[PDB]
Amino acid sequence: TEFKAGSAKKGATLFKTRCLQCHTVEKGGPHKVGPNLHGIFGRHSGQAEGYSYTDANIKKNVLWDENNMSEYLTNPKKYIPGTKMAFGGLKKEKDRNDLITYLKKASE
Amino acid sequence: TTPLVHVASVEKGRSYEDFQKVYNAIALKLREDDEYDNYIGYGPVLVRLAWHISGTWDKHDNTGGSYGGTYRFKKEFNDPSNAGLQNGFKFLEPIHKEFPWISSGDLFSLGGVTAVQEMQGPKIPWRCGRVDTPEDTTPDNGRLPDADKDAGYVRTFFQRLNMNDREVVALMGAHALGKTHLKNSGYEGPWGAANNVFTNEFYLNLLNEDWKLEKNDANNEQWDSKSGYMMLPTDYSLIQDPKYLSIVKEYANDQDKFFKDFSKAFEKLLENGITFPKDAPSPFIFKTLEEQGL
Amino acid sequence: TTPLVHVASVEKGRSYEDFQKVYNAIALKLREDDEYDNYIGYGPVLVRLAWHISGTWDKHDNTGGSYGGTYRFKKEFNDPSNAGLQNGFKFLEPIHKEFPWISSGDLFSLGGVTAVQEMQGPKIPWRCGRVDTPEDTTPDNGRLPDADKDAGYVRTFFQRLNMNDREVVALMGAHALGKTHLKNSGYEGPWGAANNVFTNEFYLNLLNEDWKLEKNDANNEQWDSKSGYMMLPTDYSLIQDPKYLSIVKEYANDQDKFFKDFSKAFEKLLENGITFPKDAPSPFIFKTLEEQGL
Ligand code: HEC
Numbered sequence: 001t002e003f004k005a006g007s008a009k010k011g012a013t014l015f016k017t018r019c020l021q022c023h024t025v026e027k028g029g030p031h032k033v034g035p036n037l038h039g040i041f042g043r044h045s046g047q048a049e050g051y052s053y054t055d056a057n058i059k060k061n062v063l064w065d066e067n068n069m070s071e072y073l074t075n076p077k078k079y080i081p082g083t084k085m086a087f088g089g090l091k092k093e094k095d096r097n098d099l100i101t102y103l104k105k106a107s108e
Numbered sequence: 109t110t111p112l113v114h115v116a117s118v119e120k121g122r123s124y125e126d127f128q129k130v131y132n133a134i135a136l137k138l139r140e141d142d143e144y145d146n147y148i149g150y151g152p153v154l155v156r157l158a159w160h161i162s163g164t165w166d167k168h169d170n171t172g173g174s175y176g177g178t179y180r181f182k183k184e185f186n187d188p189s190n191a192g193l194q195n196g197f198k199f200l201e202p203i204h205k206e207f208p209w210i211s212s213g214d215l216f217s218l219g220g221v222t223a224v225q226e227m228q229g230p231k232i233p234w235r236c237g238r239v240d241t242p243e244d245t246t247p248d249n250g251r252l253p254d255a256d257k258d259a260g261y262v263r264t265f266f267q268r269l270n271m272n273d274r275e276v277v278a279l280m281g282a283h284a285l286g287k288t289h290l291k292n293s294g295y296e297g298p299w300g301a302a303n304n305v306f307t308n309e310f311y312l313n314l315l316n317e318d319w320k321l322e323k324n325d326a327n328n329e330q331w332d333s334k335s336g337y338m339m340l341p342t343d344y345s346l347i348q349d350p351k352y353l354s355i356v357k358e359y360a361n362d363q364d365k366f367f368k369d370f371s372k373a374f375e376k377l378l379e380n381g382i383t384f385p386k387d388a389p390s391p392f393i394f395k396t397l398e399e400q401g402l
Numbered sequence: 403t404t405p406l407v408h409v410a411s412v413e414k415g416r417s418y419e420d421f422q423k424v425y426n427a428i429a430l431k432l433r434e435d436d437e438y439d440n441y442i443g444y445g446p447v448l449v450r451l452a453w454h455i456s457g458t459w460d461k462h463d464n465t466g467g468s469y470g471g472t473y474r475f476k477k478e479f480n481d482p483s484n485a486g487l488q489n490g491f492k493f494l495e496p497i498h499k500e501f502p503w504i505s506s507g508d509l510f511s512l513g514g515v516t517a518v519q520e521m522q523g524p525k526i527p528w529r530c531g532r533v534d535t536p537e538d539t540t541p542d543n544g545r546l547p548d549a550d551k552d553a554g555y556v557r558t559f560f561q562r563l564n565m566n567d568r569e570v571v572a573l574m575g576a577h578a579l580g581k582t583h584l585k586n587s588g589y590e591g592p593w594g595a596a597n598n599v600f601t602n603e604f605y606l607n608l609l610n611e612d613w614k615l616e617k618n619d620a621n622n623e624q625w626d627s628k629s630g631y632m633m634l635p636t637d638y639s640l641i642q643d644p645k646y647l648s649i650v651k652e653y654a655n656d657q658d659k660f661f662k663d664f665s666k667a668f669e670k671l672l673e674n675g676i677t678f679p680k681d682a683p684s685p686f687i688f689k690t691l692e693e694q695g696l
């Protein structure tokens with residue numbers, strides 16, 4: 001695709017340090033500060049049960065595929081303005097492709 | 109007759125554009141060296157550094173403060189209350205080699221302003237003019253606050269820095285950044301989830317979490333929550349004290365008010381002890397990396 | 403044979419406030435029933451409905467248009483080109499029972515104006531006075547355009563609606579809203595990502611995306627992009643004709659010019675066939691829900 005594919009082992013270290021404090025990747029998992037990321041690939045933005053999302057994340061309604069997710073993780077408040085996702089941003093392409101490779105295998 | 113007058117003197121020949129270049133260098137390295145401290149990055153240690161070099165100030169005799177840049181000297185460097193900060197110094201030294209003209213105090217304080225702005229925080233007006241002083245003027249160890257204390261201590265300590273209730277509660281909100289490290293202070297864990305993005309999370313966590321007083325691995329007592337967050341006894345004292353509690357609530361409910369108050373209080377913290385002349389330029393508001401298209 | 407005069411007659415004793423109340427009811431139901439069509443809402447179907455009832459007009463004999471509100475009857479209700487519009491009617495009928503004094507034509511056209519404004523589009527002046535006409539004034543099927551067509555067809559079709567090149571390119575911009583559904587028209591997919599908000603995205607996508615002619619599951623051909631967007635052959639014809647192309651380029655660059663031209667052309671579309679007495683009140687510009695606090 002337009003995005004490559006990296007190491008799922010690095011993306012595991014990138015998730016446990018930059019995403020786990022808010023997210024969880026297993027089935028029927030907890031909704032901490034952020035939603036359960038299981039099955040997020042092939043689903044629309046703001047469709048996971050039992051969580052209160054912001055009106056900006058719902059009204060954007062984009063199918064989460066590996067390409068538009070890379071645009072999200074680089075700057076969250078730019079692609080979807082008004083979202084409560086307090087994240088700085090993955091500025092490196094290598095850090096993005098490694099994380100998506102892990103998220104493709106952990107959330108499916 | 110009077111205390112120490114620390115008069116600001118702009119570095120030989122420098123203006124806004126020169127300092128924007130130092131900000132840009134610090135901001136870029138903050139983006140580049142993102143692997144530090146389990147990917148939290150150097151942002152939090154830079155604001156802690158800016159605070160610790162400023163926090164040595166004593167309003168009664170005008171000793172300490174950011175002016176002299178005395179952190180570069182042994183005594184203040186090896187202060188155990190400064191453990192962890194050597195990483196902030198190591199970050200800033202190649203930037204000092206790139207810009208040898210900037211004083212130590214200006215660089216240390218600019219590092220903090222840069223870190224807050226780059227972590228999506230409020231714009232913090234900054235003034236230049238701090239001048240390096242000899243080894244004499246190096247403040248004695250023990251001027252920084254102890255974390256194992258109460259509200260009365262916090263209030264009385266901050267009086268030495270000319271900070272009122274609103275200013276201390278505002279300043280403490282920087283604890284939304286980074287974490288406590290057992291090896292450094294004897295305390296362990298983050299105050300929040302958004303470790304490297306400046307928000308009002310500190311106040312939200314103080315109020316919305318169920319806190320329990322437990323002993324850590326260094327045998328120190330801290331307040332821990334089920335979400336994996338922590339609060340130092342001095343942080344938790346902000347909700348034990350009724351006057352501090354109302355301000356904590358105000359900031360938890362209004363991030364804009366927190367930003368405005370923090371900006372003023374942080375600028376004051378970094379400027380404490382410095383007398384700025386009237387021919388001296390107006391405070392600089394630096395453009396972020398994002399505003400420059402990066 | 404000789405042309406039909408359709409004189410606007412204001413609903414007895416009704417003024418601005420009465421119609422603002424109908425606008426508010428539509429607007430609130432639009433916010434409430436946000437579940438519909440994968441969270442796109444009923445907004446797009448309401449503007450499609452306002453266009454479909456108005457697009458039946460024939461200038462040569464003054465038959466059809468928004469005046470009579472004749473969509474409610476069986477013949478125009480079951481027109482294939484009207485597939486999917488039943489949802490728009492289902493949406494508007496409880497609002498009609500809530501305000502039984504409003505004519506069908508007035509409600510249908512107001513639904514369109516309301517939808518555009520509530521989705522952050524331009525203010526569209528709207529005039530009341532459409533009067534309900536019987537079952538035989540009901541226009542014959544096949545008066546709406548075919549999507550499969552080229553620029554020459556689009557131009558000639560819109561001539562029947564007294565629309566010039568600027569008016570048709572402006573009107574087609576409503577395709578920034580919603581999507582094509584295979585079960586309805588035999589075409590599938592959205593024209594843009596911002597489906598529930600009125601923008602100039604239709605023109606930006608038409609010019610900036612890499613389009614490829616492809617067959618769909620209903621065996622019709624449409625233009626598709628790698629980003630998942632589509633264009634009907636009639637839409638793509640706007641970049642094949644040189645006159646329409648210049649106007650597409652103009653709107654892609656200037657959203658404010660598109661907003662101004664769309665408001666004029668949409669109002670004209672909704673008013674086609676109606677003779678307004680100098681009597682008659684000035685057009686109403688309704689306040690949005692946001693403008694009323696709510
Ligand atoms: C905590 C402070 C966060 C960190 C660090 C990360 N995310 Fe998160 N995320 C968080 C919240 C509060 C929300 C909800 C936003 C809203 O507007 O309601 C999210 C959301 C997402 C989503 C979208 C889910 C959906 O729409 O169904 C995704 C795909 C997501 N976050 C991914 C993600 C990744 C991979 C991260 C690691 C680097 C990450 N987030 C960190 C809060 C926080």
Ligand code: ZNH
Nearest residue numbers: 152153156159192253254255279282286287288289292293
């Ligand atoms: C009372 C008072 C007080 C006290 C006691 C304190 C204390 C503290 C401690 C203990 C710690 C830890 C260290 C380690 O590493 O381990 C910290 C950190 C800290 N800190 Zn803080 N503080 C304070 C204030 C403060 C202020 C005022 C500020 C600013 C503004 C700050 C900022 C900080 C930061 C940011 C940090 C981070 C670091 C890192 O992470 O690295 N701070 N601190």
Ligand code: ZNH
Nearest residue numbers: 446447450453486548549573576579580581582583586587
């Ligand atoms: C040429 C011409 C033309 C044509 C052919 C058309 C066609 C069409 C089609 C095919 C469709 C689809 C349907 C389904 O569902 O599937 C549509 C839709 C449509 N549409 Zn459009 N159109 C047109 C014009 C138009 C106009 C003029 C307007 C207005 C103004 C419109 C608006 C519309 C809308 C909005 C829509 C969407 C809807 C939904 O989504 O629901 N439109 N459309």
